[PDB]
Amino acid sequence: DLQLKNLEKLSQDTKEESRLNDTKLMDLQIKYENEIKPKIDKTDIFIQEE
Amino acid sequence: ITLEKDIKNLKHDINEKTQINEKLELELSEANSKFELSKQENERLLVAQR
To answer: How many angstroms separate the CA of residue B30 from the nearest CA in chain A?
Structure first.
């Protein structure tokens, strides 16, 4: 029962840390793509057109 | 003769409970192996995400 509870807690922590890592990666990629990338675009437009 | 029959039946019970305990010990070793394999697999997945 101790090992079964350990496996249950392992599965719970595994799914929790998996969703945490996934959320971190997509949120940071979203920061790159919707904040950093528009800044790249604005900087390039300012350099070229102006 | 009744006590000998009781001894035989209680030895049968001993054998049944010994089979149960052998199954429990096999399941405990299997639980240790499954814990190791599962937590290392989850570690691999989480570390790849990291």
So the answer is: 10
